[PDB]
Amino acid sequence: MFNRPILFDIVSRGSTADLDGLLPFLLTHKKRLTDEEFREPSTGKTCLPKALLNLSNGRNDTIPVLLDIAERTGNMREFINSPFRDIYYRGQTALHIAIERRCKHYVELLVAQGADVHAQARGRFFQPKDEGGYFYFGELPLSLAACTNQPHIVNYLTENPHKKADMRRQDSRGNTVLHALVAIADNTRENTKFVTKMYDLLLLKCARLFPDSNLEAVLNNDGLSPLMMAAKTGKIGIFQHIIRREV
Numbered sequence: 049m050f051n052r053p054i055l056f057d058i059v060s061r062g063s064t065a066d067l068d069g070l071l072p073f074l075l076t077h078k079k080r081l082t083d084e085e086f087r088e089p090s091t092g093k094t095c096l097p098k099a100l101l102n103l104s105n106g107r108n109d110t111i112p113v114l115l116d117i118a119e120r121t122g123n124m125r126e127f128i129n130s131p132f133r134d135i136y137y138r139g140q141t142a143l144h145i146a147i148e149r150r151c152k153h154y155v156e157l158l159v160a161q162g163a164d165v166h167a168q169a170r171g172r173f174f175q176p177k178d179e180g181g182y183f184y185f186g187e188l189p190l191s192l193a194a195c196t197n198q199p200h201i202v203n204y205l206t207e208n209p210h211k212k213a214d215m216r217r218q219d220s221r222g223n224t225v226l227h228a229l230v231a232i233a234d235n236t237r238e239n240t241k242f243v244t245k246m247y248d249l250l251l252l253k254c255a256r257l258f259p260d261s262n263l264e265a266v267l268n269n270d271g272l273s274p275l276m277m278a279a280k281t282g283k284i285g286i287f288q289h290i291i292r293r294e295v
C-alpha cells in the first residue's frame with residue numbers, strides 16, 4: 049500500500065523499483081500526490097522536495113517518475129509549485145532546492161515542466177542572519193542562482209524557451225538580484241571575485257535584453273540603489289568595482 053511514511057521512505061532511498069504501483073494506487077483511490085495524506089502536516093512538504101533533499105551524486109531517479117505520475121493524476125503544475133507553508137521555510141519550492149543543491153538538470157526539468165520561476169522563499173530561514181535567518185539571497189530563484197555563484201543556472205533561468213526569470217524583479221524588501229549580490233558580498237577575495245563577475249553579467253544581460261530599463265536605478269524599500277546599499281553597509285569590494293566602470 050502507499051501512505052506518507054512509505055512514500056517518503058521510498059523516495060528518500062531513491063528507489064524507483066518501489067514506486068511500482070503508485071500511479072494505479074492513486075487512480076483507483078481518487079488520490080493525488082498533493083493531497084494532505086501525502087504531505088508533512090507541519091510544513092506542507094510533498095515528496096518532491098523530499099526527493100530533492102536526498103540526492104546521491106545529485107541524482108534521485110524518483111523525481112522524473114514522481115513528476116510523470118503527477119502529470120497523469122492531472123496534477124503536475126500544482127505538484128511542482130507546492131510551497132513549504134510553515135513560518136520558517138515558507139514559500140520554498142522544489143525549484144529553490146534544485147538550485148541550492150546545485151543540480152542544473154533538475155532545474156531544467158522543473159522549469160520545462162512549469163515551475164513558477166518567481167517563487168519567493170520568504171520564511172525565517174531565508175531572511176538575514178541578524179533577523180534570525182540562515183542565508184539571505186533575495187528570496188527569488190534567479191537571485192538565489194546569482195548569490196550562490198551558478199552562472200550556468202543564471203543563464204538558463206533568464207533565457208530559456210519555457211519561462212524566463214525577469215531580472216528586474218524585487219523581493220519583500222524590494223531587493224533585486226543586484227541588491228542581493230551586495231548583501232551576499234563580504235569583501236573576501238574569492239567572494240568579491242564572483243560577486244563582481246556576476247554583477248557585470250547581470251547588468252550587461254539586462255541592458256542587452258530590455259534595451260532601456262536601467263537596473264541599477266531600481267531602488268530597494270529603504271530607497272537605496274545597489275551602489276548606495278554597498279556604501280551604506282561597508283561593502284568596500286563591490287562598491288569600488290561599481291564605481292570603476294563609470295565615465
Ligand SMILES: Nc1ncnc2c1ncn2[C@@H]1O[C@H](COP(=O)(O)OP(=O)(O)OP(=O)(O)O)[C@@H](O)[C@H]1O
Binds near residue numbers: 060101102140
Ligand atoms: N527545507 C529544507 N531546505 C534545505 N535543507 C533541508 C530542509 N529540510 C531539511 N534539510 C536538510 O537536508 C537533509 C534532507 O532532509 P530530508 O527531508 O531528507 O530529511 P528530514 O525530513 O529533514 O529529516 P528526516 O531524515 O527525519 O526525514 C536533512 O538532513 C536536513 O539537514
Ligand SMILES: OC[C@H]1O[C@@H](O)[C@H](O)[C@@H](O)[C@@H]1O
Binds near residue numbers: 235237238239240
Ligand atoms: O576563504 C578562503 C579564502 O578566500 C578569499 O576570498 C579570502 O580573502 C581569504 O582570506 C581566504 O583564505
